Design a protein around this ligand. Sequence first.
Ligand SMILES: Nc1cc(-c2ccccc2)no1
Ligand SMILES: [Mn+2]
Ligand SMILES: [Mn+2]
Lengths: 137, 137
Amino acid sequence: MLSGLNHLTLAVSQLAPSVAFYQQLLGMTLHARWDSGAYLSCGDLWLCLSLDPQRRVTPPEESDYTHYAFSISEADFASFAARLEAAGVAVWKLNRSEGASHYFLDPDGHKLELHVGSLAQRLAACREQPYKGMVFF
Amino acid sequence: MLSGLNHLTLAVSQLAPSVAFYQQLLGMTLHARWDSGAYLSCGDLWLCLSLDPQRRVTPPEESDYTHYAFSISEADFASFAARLEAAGVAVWKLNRSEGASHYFLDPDGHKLELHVGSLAQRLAACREQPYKGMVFF
Ligand SMILES: Nc1cc(-c2ccccc2)no1
Ligand SMILES: [Mn+2]
Ligand SMILES: [Mn+2]
């Protein structure tokens, strides 16, 4: 039986700018680096950056909705989003829902998100105002 | 400050086969389903499946190394891997070894992995046989 996410690996086109983004801009802990990768952590999350000649810097119009959201508190949300704006980090979507989300791109065009709130909170909001066709189990 | 992964969203081309894969075959818990998505959990992981007509199915040889690994115990690893092979789940190949892992594809070509072991165990293994150019912090 599966017990959770073990690690998330992102393919990157250039290691140095990606390590700078995840370690210095986003504040993740760098544990190890080698000629073709790095291991970082963010709380419980193990993140691997893998240098991949097949990775292209992908504009958000050319990739699908697959994305990775990181947890942050409401109190820290606005200042963290302002930090990203100062560094010139691109936004790929406006938040059009209730709840706090900021949608931003990494150097290779991986789609990231800052989100406040848990699955339980989302389910409770959906029970009050369900999506079309929604069934609960 | 970022505190970990809030959720993982995968774009899928057909909702029903994806829900069946993650719930029936992988054993994740299905919380809700609606006309264009579903919410599942796997331990602490909140997984969202999002119906996206822009999702293409690409051979693993022409997609990059971005992939998602799920935790499984030593006692369950081999029997779970054998169940996936018996169900006809397709495999893919990574360019390097990272310990006890089984690599498989979801119905849309997302690259998945079963892995035994934590980040701390991986760093200890790497100290004894480092990748090229490895530095530890
Ligand atoms: N065959 C089948 C359909 C469904 C369903 C569940 C929730 C929402 C819409 C459809 N569950 O099983
Ligand atoms: Mn999201
Ligand atoms: Mn892996």
